[PDB]
Structure 1
Amino acid sequence: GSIGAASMEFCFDVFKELKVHHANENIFYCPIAIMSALAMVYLGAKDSTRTQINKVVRFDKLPGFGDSIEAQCGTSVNVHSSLRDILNQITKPNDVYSFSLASRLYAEERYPILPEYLQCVKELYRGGLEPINFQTAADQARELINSWVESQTNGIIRNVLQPSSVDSQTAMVLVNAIVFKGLWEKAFKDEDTQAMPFRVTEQESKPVQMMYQIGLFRVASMASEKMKILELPFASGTMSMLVLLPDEVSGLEQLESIINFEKLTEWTSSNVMEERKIKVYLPRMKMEEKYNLTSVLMAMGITDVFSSSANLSGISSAESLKISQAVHAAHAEINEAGREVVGSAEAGVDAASVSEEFRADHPFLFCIKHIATNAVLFFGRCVSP
């Protein structure tokens, strides 16, 4: 449809799969980065390999994804526009946030690559495709890969490929790693951050650095679902963080069952949300998770790429090229830093007068979105900040 709708539906499909396998843990991933890793594959994919991707990853009627347009890969700025526009906007140097994307296919050097796919994927994608010797020097190849990621991510994402996840037999490895740091519009003051208990369960607490401010924020109270949603804008008005906080320390299970694109949209509508002065408590958070994309996508219906049945004819003519490993790694730190702070006097008066709070001191969901398109950039479950 549109990139907003497509990333969100994709996001909740992945979430359904991951919540299976990661109960009572933090979850954090970047749907947009995953989409762009797969777009790259999609480009050279054919037949059933291609149709599986399209159905799962929602590529269908996005602007810039048709086979007619794709055919023009080398020579047209329209190809994959809908996705490339967001990546381009978020990866550009700027003064209020930083994204680092390290996303690449590593292909065994013995397989011959179509000159006109290398060119295509280089035009549209950064990282693209890189040839490498798995056949005679896997642990070397693994070191190369790891050290490219660590370099492109400012040393943050280390040992993306674990030992003996490549070997002489590896054909092609997908690597997709992302770091984000942004400033709030309204900073929390460091002096206001305090140790407070985070209630993981009813019967269990862990002390965390809890940030605090009073400010004018958009909030919705969904009494029917027993929850509240807060929106915290990032500086320069192109992204925001939504935090979905169940009333009860263990209301998460329910929310996770019901949440979907339609529900998120309903809950965050103009209609429902209103700007109020509120006391905000939010943990400082350092989210980092790494997922095996093979297991995930394969439960979702993408199977051919990872096997003998792969048709990647648009990439190599070499019959046996498939995806051997596919990893996603996402890192974000959430802390005080922002552009503006309220005067003290103001806050003292506020303190006195404001009674409503949003106290995120128990598990919550969060989503970072691009405002304009409603694209989901990051989605997570915070159980242990």
Structure 2
Amino acid sequence: SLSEANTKFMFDLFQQFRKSKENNIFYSPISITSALGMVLLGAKDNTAQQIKKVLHFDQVTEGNVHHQFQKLLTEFNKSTDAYELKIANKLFGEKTYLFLQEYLDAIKKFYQTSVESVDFANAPEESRKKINSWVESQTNEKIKNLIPEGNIGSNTTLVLVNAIYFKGQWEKKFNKEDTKEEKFWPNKNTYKSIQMMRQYTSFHFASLEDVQAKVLEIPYKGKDLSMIVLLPNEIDGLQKLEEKLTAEKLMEWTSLQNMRETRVDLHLPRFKVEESYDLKDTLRTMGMVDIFNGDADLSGMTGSRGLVLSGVLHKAFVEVTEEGAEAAAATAVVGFNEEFHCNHPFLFFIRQNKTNSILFYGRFSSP
């Protein structure tokens, strides 16, 4: 399945980010998947095999990555009085550049992509600003400057973008009166102050005696989405939890079968994470290499070989407060009885419960 392939890709990414991200980590795997899916639709041969492999689409059973992405996107684009979820894809092309009508039709149909043309050739700065400004408009202005200066030139011919936006009330809101200053330990011998929200209510909970950690599910109102938190038992237990975590174990540890309704004294910080990623080298390292060099085959975009990707950028935001949470991200592809006290490092993610998809994943290491 496509959701399962997205989680695996998510954990592959995380193992890479652990090398260059010392503190907080936060991203939208689905955003990245959706962008690179749009690329896949116009890739051929080994350019296409590499992408498929890196994203785990070679494991998606009934071309059908795309069919499935269309379902997923329709399922995600739902807002309610209690939350909003939105995911939008767009192609910005050089106004003079021609794409195959079949590539354009395919991205419109499977990825709901809107197509705009811009003047990269003579106004690349202004084109860059238009794109950044569209992203802002899709993310309640939480993702600003997705594409910084110099990642677009007069020779840029395409920018494929995914934006994802979520804002949700908690099913059980925290009382702001109960929020208090506390110590947050990023390391055993070190602390930063933090605003700690506190609540005592029941939640799905499990003790993972094996990895010496706990899991909690914190639902949004309506329960169409939840934030899941994984908290090591020890201040410094995160690395081992990180070493042990795989797609299968996550699915195992976070299924309702393996959790139980439990009264939990939940202490969760008010927090915000903003992180930017240049993914070109990360993606090459994981196996996507033709796409970025002279062996690129993106002839399914234009009728013949010649397009190469110059860049892939990702930016993500999340803020957690007493009322709920707001999370956004965007991806640009450029072509030419129990306690649960979160006062030390933890992993968290926002899950779409119906599809069982992970929309956003992160590590909170330090305010």
Residue in 1 aligned with 2:214? 228
Residue in 2 aligned with 1:30? 28
Answer whether contact 1:172 1:321 (CA < 8 A) is retained: no
SS in 1 for 2:258: coil
2:136 counterpart (147, 150, 161): 150
Residue in 1 aligned with 2:201? 215
TM superposition shift of 1:120: 2.2
SS in 1 for 2:302: coil
Residue in 1 aligned with 2:12? 13
Answer whether contact 2:275 2:316 (CA < 8 A) is retained: yes
Listed one character per residue, the Cα deviations across residues 48-97 of structure 1 (whole Å, up to 9, x for unaligned) are 1111111111223535634xxxxxxxxxxxx8342222322222232221
SS in 2 for 1:186: coil
Structure 2 CA distance for aligned equivalents of residues 308 and 111 of structure 1: 20
Structure 2 CA distance for aligned equivalents of residues 282 and 81 of structure 1: 39
Residue 40 of structure 1 aligns with an amino acid whose one-letter code is M
**1:78-227 equivalent positions in 2, closer than 5 A:** 80-227=66-213
Answer whether contact 1:174 1:323 (CA < 8 A) is retained: no
Answer whether contact 1:218 1:276 (CA < 8 A) is retained: yes
Answer whether contact 1:112 1:318 (CA < 8 A) is retained: no
TM superposition shift of 1:332: 2.3
Identity of aligned residues (%): 43
Listed one character per residue, the Cα deviations across residues 306-361 of structure 1 (whole Å, up to 9, x for unaligned) are 222211112113542122222222222221216xxxxxxxxxxxxxxx5x311001
Residue 350 of structure 2 aligns with an amino acid whose one-letter code is I
Rg: which structure is higher? 1
In structure 2, stretches of 5+ residues that fail to align are 325-336
- Residue 380 in 1 paired to residue 366 in 2? no
1:309 counterpart (292, 295, 309): 295
Identify which range, 314-323 or 229-238, moves more after superposition. Answer: 314-323
- Residue 275 in 1 paired to residue 274 in 2? no
Calculate the TM-score normalised by the size of structure 2.
0.90
Structure 2 CA distance for aligned equivalents of residues 118 and 272 of structure 1: 45
SS in 1 for 2:132: helix
Answer whether contact 2:78 2:86 (CA < 8 A) is retained: no
Residue 9 of structure 1 aligns with an amino acid whose one-letter code is K
Rate the CA distance shift 1:63–1:93 in 2: closer, same or farther, 3 A. farther
RMSD between superposed Cα atoms in Å = 2.0
Residue in 1 aligned with 2:38? 40
Residue in 1 aligned with 2:334? none
In structure 1, stretches of 5+ residues that fail to align are 67-78, 339-353
Rate the CA distance shift 1:221–1:253 in 2: closer, same or farther, 3 A. same
Residue 49 of structure 2 aligns with an amino acid whose one-letter code is T
Answer whether contact 2:270 2:321 (CA < 8 A) is retained: yes
Rate the CA distance shift 1:211–1:195 in 2: closer, same or farther, 3 A. same
Answer whether contact 1:157 1:177 (CA < 8 A) is retained: no
Answer whether contact 2:299 2:306 (CA < 8 A) is retained: no
TM superposition shift of 1:363: 0.6
Structure 2 CA distance for aligned equivalents of residues 374 and 200 of structure 1: 30
Residue in 2 aligned with 1:359? 341
Structure 1 CA distance for aligned equivalents of residues 150 and 186 of structure 2: 35
